[PDB]
Design a protein around this ligand. Structure first.
Ligand SMILES: COc1ccc(Cl)cc1S(=O)(=O)N1CCc2c(C)cc(C(=O)Nc3ccc(C(=O)O)c(Cl)c3)cc21
Ligand SMILES: CCCCCCCCO[C@@H]1O[C@H](CO)[C@@H](O)[C@H](O)[C@H]1O
Length: 625
């Protein structure tokens, strides 16, 4: 059948009974905010912030909190942060390229020849539509985080829970320490796009569409991957259409339209309207409503730097940046999912990503020896054409100048630390994630002699319409431990550094659990600011404090997702003087892919990260520094 999975439990079985996302006590948000400020502020900056905090907590903040709670109680079908968070993305006017869109790259097919570009593009594409079909059929297994997989993640639990009504099913999984996740974001994974509009962008979906959008040398192509009966088009026919696309010898267009999706959001909103005015609505509707966008690049990868540049931004001609995701397949079979961040988070993309990798490689639709179906692809496949006015052409030239000039200033480099990873760190009773994060704090002290605002993403998908919460890994413990390692290695014994590292780790683990439970401060303070603004009130003095603005000017912006499917990921910094740190602790090694603009140096930082991990592992091994 066309299904990559056959769950006896309906995909959506838990969604009705997911726990509502908790609003913290204002007193706890304030304390947690000040705790994260302690490592960042001089003493008089801190007392200034502490005083604004007390004024907020007793006054306008107390009142905002009261309304947020009452508003939440009116809207128990959703989460307090859902609207504000969507609005955060969609009102933002900056280019989504680099500011927002990340990538995750697949490991190769472990069968060498299956990495042929036509073979791999057909196989990945077909596994992606199989995902779509399985989700549509409610045959995708529900997302569940298990505390005791061996006992709750079992045929036997599944045969029982399927009988509990969705109004109560969450409770059953909870009672066996299993934690179902929100899956509402999968409504926008496919047939979906972000549409630029003034003020606030729009999220568009068209479930009725059956066609694929392919980009090659910046030419646009569509063909059906689902027939009129709802079945997947024969893979050997999909393979012929892809072969046919791969045979076009048209050079890159003089005005590649995809550039426009990299623009400032107001500029692009305006130019899109001109496109409609000049009669391109039908063409745009076909781009917008496609299952996803397949990008076919005609070069192989030179190295991981080249790979990261390619999957993160490319040359601007060959990604439709607005689309829910772009599935990229290069000339050497190197593939990745580049995605737009407003509609959903890493956790939902990861599931899709893991299922497609598994299916495409273990149950491939075609083989590298498959013969394409005899079929007339000039009938099946339409090459789209945009009617470009003089203003549209000038618009595209300007998009291209901005793209090229901004991209030139981006550097990305990586390290593979091979002394150890999870296995050694767990043996030492330390959280591996805390160790990675301490290394980044420590490397930055070494490189710049400062402690800076640090961001780590954490899913709150365990709750109804939960998104992410911010983990703030820069603490008084990472700061004191960094100072000990960098500023006076002499002063401390291996025992003391070991104990210091253990305190970082205990604090990190605490913030982690709190963030996953919705008990960080960032989302809560953001929702109060949002509410004040939406009510038409002046922005409260708390948010005008430079220490607040500084907390949200994230110089160290970090993220990790891990799975056997992912080789590496990448994203740009959020601020011009920042780093964008994609990392993973594996069983045996630690990988970081770091980005920076001109105002920082990724290469030196990785040298400092490398050095810091070696000192960390020595101290843990019993040696001096
Ligand atoms: C053994 O580790 C894992 C096991 C299974 C999985 Cl699915 C993921 C991981 S992990 O590598 O991704 N993991 C390590 C510790 C950790 C922490 C502290 C946070 C997160 C996390 O929530 N990541 C994350 C990062 C970014 C986003 C996003 O939307 O951008 C989202 Cl939803 C989530 C993952 C992980
Ligand atoms: C190792 C895998 C790394 C890729 C992670 C996929 C999700 C990345 O999401 C990224 O998170 C950052 C906040 O931490 C933001 O600054 C970026 O704009 C965003 O793309």
């Amino acid at each position: 059948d066309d299904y990559l999975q056959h769950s006896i439990v309906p995909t959506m079985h838990y969604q009705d009974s997911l726990p509502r996302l908790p609003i913290p006590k204002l007193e706890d948000t304030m304390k947690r905010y000040l705790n994260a400020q302690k490592p960042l502020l001089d003493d008089s900056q801190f007392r200034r912030t502490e005083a604004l905090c007390k004024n907020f907590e007793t006054g306008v903040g107390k009142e905002l909190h009261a309304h947020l709670l009452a508003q939440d109680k009116q809207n128990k079908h959703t989460s307090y942060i859902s609207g504000p968070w969507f609005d955060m993305y969609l009102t933002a006017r900056d280019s989504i390229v680099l500011n927002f869109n990340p990538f995750m790259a697949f490991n190769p097919d472990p069968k060498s020849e299956y990495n042929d570009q036509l073979t791999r593009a057909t196989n990945l594409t077909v596994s992606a539509v199989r995902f779509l079909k399985t989700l549509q059929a409610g045959l995708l297994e529900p997302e569940v985080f298990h505390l005791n997989p061996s006992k709750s993640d079992t045929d036997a639990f599944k045969r029982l829970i399927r009988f509990v009504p969705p109004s109560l099913s969450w409770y059953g999984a909870y009672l066996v320490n299993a934690y179902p996740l929100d899956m509402s974001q999968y409504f926008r994974l496919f047939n979906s796009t972000r549409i630029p509009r003034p003020n606030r962008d729009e999220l568009f979906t068209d479930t009725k569409a059956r066609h694929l959008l392919v980009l090659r040398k910046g030419h646009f192509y569509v063909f059906d991957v689902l027939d009129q009966d709802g079945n997947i088009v024969n893979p050997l026919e999909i393979q012929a259409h892809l072969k046919y696309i791969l045979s076009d010898s048209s050079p890159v267009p003089e005005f590649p339209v995809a550039y426009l999706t990299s623009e400032n959001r107001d500029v692009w909103a305006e130019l899109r309207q001109k496109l409609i005015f000049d009669g391109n609505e039908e063409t745009l509707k076909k781009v917008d409503s496609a299952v996803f966008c397949l990008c076919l690049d005609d070069f192989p990868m030179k190295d991981l730097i080249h790979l990261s540049h390619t999957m993160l931004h490319g040359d601007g001609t060959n990604r439709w940046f607005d689309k829910s995701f772009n599935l990229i397949v290069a000339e050497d079979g190197t593939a990745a999912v580049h995605f737009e961040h407003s509609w959903g988070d890493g956790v939902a993309v990861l599931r899709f990503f893991n299922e497609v990798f598994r299916d495409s490689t273990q149950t491939p639709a075609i083989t590298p020896q498959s013969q394409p179906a005899a079929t007339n692809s000039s009938a099946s496949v339409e090459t789209l054409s945009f009617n470009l006015s003089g203003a549209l052409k000038a618009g595209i030239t300007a998009a291209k100048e901005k793209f090229d000039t901004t991209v030139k200033t981006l550097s990305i480099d990586s390290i593979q630390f091979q002394r150890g990873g999870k296995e050694f760190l767990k043996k030492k009773q330390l959280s591996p994630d805390a160790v990675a994060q301490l290394a980044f704090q420590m490397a930055f002290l070494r490189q710049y002699g400062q402690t800076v605002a640090t961001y780590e993403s954490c899913s709150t998908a365990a709750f109804k319409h939960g998104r992410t919460e911010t983990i703030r890994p820069a603490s008084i413990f990472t700061k004191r431990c960094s100072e000990a390692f960098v500023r006076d290695p002499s002063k401390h014994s291996v025992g003391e550094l070991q104990h210091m590292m253990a305190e970082c780790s205990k604090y990190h683990g605490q913030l982690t659990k709190e963030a996953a439970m919705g008990q960080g401060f960032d989302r809560h303070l953001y929702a109060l600011r949002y509410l004040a603004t939406a009510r038409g009130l002046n922005l409260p003095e708390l948010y005008l404090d430079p220490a607040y603005q500084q907390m949200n000017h994230n110089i160290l912006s970090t993220s990790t997702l891990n799975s056997p499917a992912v080789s590496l990921g990448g994203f740009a910094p959020v601020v011009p003087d920042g780093f964008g740190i994609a990392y993973a602790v594996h069983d045996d090694w630690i990988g970081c892919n770091v980005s920076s603009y001109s105002g920082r140096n990724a290469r030196e930082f990785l040298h400092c990260v490398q050095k810091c991990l070696e000192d960390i592992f020595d101290a843990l091994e019993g040696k001096a520094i």
